[PDB]
Amino acid sequence: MENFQKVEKIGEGTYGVVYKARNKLTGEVVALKKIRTEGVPSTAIREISLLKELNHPNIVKLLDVIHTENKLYLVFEFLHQDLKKFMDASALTGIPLPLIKSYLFQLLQGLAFCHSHRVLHRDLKPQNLLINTEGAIKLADFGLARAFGVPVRTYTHEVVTLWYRAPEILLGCKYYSTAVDIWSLGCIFAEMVTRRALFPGDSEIDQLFRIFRTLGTPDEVVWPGVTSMPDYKPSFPKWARQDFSKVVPPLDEDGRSLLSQMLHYDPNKRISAKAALAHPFFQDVTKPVPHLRL
Ligand SMILES: COc1ccc(O)c(-c2nc(N)nc(N)n2)c1
């Protein structure tokens, strides 16, 4: 793997570290994800390789999937900045609402695309959302959990982010649906608006309880079957739902209603990416140019 010259390390994902690198021969700049290790599931590299066919303006292009030295390398087109960095950079002033709306709209288009192709992300977070100078935003690292699975931590002892995990995952559901990505996106949307994580849990139970304290402890009324979920305990405290206008001020009612639909407890009631795109919140969507400091 010396076809490059690891320009630099740029991040650490749940499935592995990401590097910025230039191809010695072609001179192209790409992002290299190294996936943690002496076997690798059979259908894994096959399933991941299929992702190379995925082409959508809001999905980071997967250029190559190489298996060498028992290691797995994903070569991605390189985008210049991740949403986490941009959010931190915009923490004093905040991301303008029209830009937030644009990003949410584009992200939903990208999810609508993947979900229609039966591809789920399962680990969406600000770190794997990439932006460019032209106002586009793209999702990176889809279908990795389906091909592999959520490990103990990361390739090299890291603190996995739980803040964007859907409640059905926290409750131990064996089968998840595309609804998990809508939940994560809802959490990201809220964070872009308030400039603070919606549910910053430090543990799985703290994550779950933070959700409960805000949205109310779920019951059979709002979520049929929740009390029979694997990790559900009748001992969970019963918090009453908080007034929603407290959740994402000062987002307007259209944004709040859309967000509430993205955060429904029942995966079956949670809005789909396709239905969300038709929400009145996007009636006036535009495509602003962000102020990016590279
Ligand atoms: C699949 O993961 C990817 C794919 C393509 C990418 O450009 C990135 C990325 N890019 C930047 N600039 N920063 C950071 N932190 N990451 C990450």
Domains of the chain (ranges, CATH numbers): 1-80 (3.30.200.20), 81-291 (1.10.510.10)
Q: Is the CB of 60 under 6 A from ligand 1?
A: yes
219 tagged catalytic: no
Q: Which one of 6, 8, 18, 22 would you pick to mutate in the ligand 1 pocket, going by the greatest count of ligand atoms within 8 A of its CB?
A: 18
C-beta atoms surrounding 246 within 10 Å: 8
| Dihedral sign computed on CA atoms, order 166, 153, 192, 214 | positive
What is the amino acid identity at position 122? R
Method used for this model? X-ray
- State the chain's maximal CA–CA distance in angstroms: 61
What is the amino acid identity at position 60? V
Using left for φ > 0, alpha for ψ between -120 and 50, and beta otherwise, residue 159 falls in beta
Cis geometry, peptide bond prior to residue 250 (ω within 30 degrees of 0):
yes
- In degrees and rounded to multiples of 5, residue 129 shows phi and psi of -115, 120
Rounded to whole angstroms, the Cα distance separating 131 from 109 reads 15
Rounded to whole angstroms, the Cα distance separating 266 from 53 reads 32
Q: Are 5 and 21 in contact (CB under 8 A)?
A: yes
Q: Is the CB of 51 under 6 A from ligand 1?
A: no
List of residues 6+ apart from 208 with CB closer than 8 A: 167, 170, 171, 201, 236
Q: Which residue in 114, 15, 22, 104 sits closest to 60, CA to CA? A: 114
C-beta atoms surrounding 185 within 10 Å: 24
141 is in an annotated binding site: yes
- Name the β-bridge partners of 82: 130
Q: Which residue in 163, 203, 205 sits closest to 187, CA to CA? A: 163
